Amino acid sequence: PKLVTWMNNQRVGELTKLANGAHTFKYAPEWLASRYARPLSLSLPLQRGNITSDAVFNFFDNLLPDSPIVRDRIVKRYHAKSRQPFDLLSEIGRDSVGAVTLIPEDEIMAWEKLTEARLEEVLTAYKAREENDFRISVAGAQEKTALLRIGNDWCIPKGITPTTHIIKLPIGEIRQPNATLDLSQSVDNEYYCLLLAKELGLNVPDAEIIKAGNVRALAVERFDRRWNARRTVLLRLPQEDMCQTFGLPSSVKYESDGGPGIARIMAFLMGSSEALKDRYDFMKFQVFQWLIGATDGHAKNFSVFIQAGGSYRLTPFYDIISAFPVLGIHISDLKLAMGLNASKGKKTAIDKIYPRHFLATAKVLRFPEVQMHEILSDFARMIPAALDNVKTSLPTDFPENVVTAVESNVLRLHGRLSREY
Questions:
Q1: Residues 242 and 306: beta-carbon distance below 8 Å
Q2: For residue 174, which of 113, 295, 372, 412 sits 20 to 30 Å off, Cα-Cα?
Q3: Are 25 and 51 in contact (CB under 8 A)?
């Protein structure tokens, strides 16, 4: 009933699942005495006592896919004891996001180099009614994996060996009453959004489209990993998402479900070690998501690195998908995951948002108006050249419809900035 918790080669504490199923956590006395001791989560501050709050269960549950559908698939794939975090983490808690390595109280750098055939088998095994909800991430079947890149080969790590890339497969088609959100090209969609963010100077990871037999996937370099100089040891870097940092369950990752939004995260970022820039980047990213029709910027898509002493700062942005390629669904149906608190009520309708809304929200959040104008002015001037630069760099087989759909819609919205800047 115990998973000993390690951050790379240092023993941090232990997660216990009691007979009644409660999850509790205790820090190791030696870790608490560690020179650069930091908490496993900002929701689990360093303390000597046994921690029994729900933040324990929620933190570890947040390390697993939040979709019940995927969980069952995982439960069956490894024959876990239950859908509970402890039982699923007892099987796959060796390599997750951040630096939490869990080892059953019971029981490196090794891997299996995959061949063209093995790669396809491995990836194909992960790929294979709705409502007036246009959210991409619901009780969906979308399940991403991870691989270890060694030299010029993709590999499956063995033991506690980490991975270097998050692998994402096509989302497929989400069907509702009288329509269907065609997300069969989400791999190319995300690749393009990541290139665009990068071109605009936003902090995001590099990614490449990988092709194995009949599989077309996105390999996103992980920023919660770092190789030593000899490329012989891959270390994990502590990080957690906004649900974890606030001690919330993944159930509330969307603001529309009671989750955190811009105001809570902005307040929390005042405590960042680089508060000034993190708040600026976070606000700049809200304008970016508006421009690109990104409707899935929920709380689990923003994370912080936990640094020595509990110090923290924003990680790069990630999991960016535009809803524009879905239109065919109306533009007026697109809503941001986190609304702009104006005064008369949060605004989420992308087609109804203009620069005045960002300035108004900035004012309420005490985000310097001069900074907001700087952000808006930058996109006013750079968007067109950025789109053209990104387009020119796309691969030979990139889907034209995706480019066209995103370009045209960004340009339409950019018109509202160029009119004021």
A1: no
A2: 412
A3: yes
Let me know: does 284 contact 368? Beta carbons within 8 Å.
Answer: no
Domains of the chain by residue range: 1-421
| Unique residue bearing structure tokens 């067109």 | 384
- Report the SS3 class of residue 109: coil
Angle (nearest 5°) at CA 105 between 36 and 22: 85
**H or E stretch including 149?**
strand 145-150
| Residues 268, 68 contacting (CB under 8 angstroms) | no
> Experimental technique used?
X-ray
- Asked whether residue 191 is marked as a ligand-binding residue, the answer is no
224-247 b/e (C-beta count within 10 Å ≥ 16 → b): bbeeeeeeeebebbbbbbbbbbbb
Quote the crossing angle between the two packed helices 355-364 and 275-291, to the nearest 10°: 150
- Report how far residue 99's alpha carbon sits from residue 384's, in angstroms, rounded to the nearest whole number: 39
Does 296 participate in catalysis according to the annotation? yes
Q: Is 377 exposed, middle or buried (0-12, 13-18, 19+ CB in 10 A)?
A: middle
| Catalytic residue of the set 296, 333, 351, 388 | 296
308 is in an annotated binding site: no
Beta-strand runs (E) in 237-366: 239-241, 303-306, 312-314, 335-340, 347-349
Q: Which positions ≥6 away from 387 have C-beta within 8 Å?
A: 196, 407, 410, 411
216 is in an annotated binding site: no
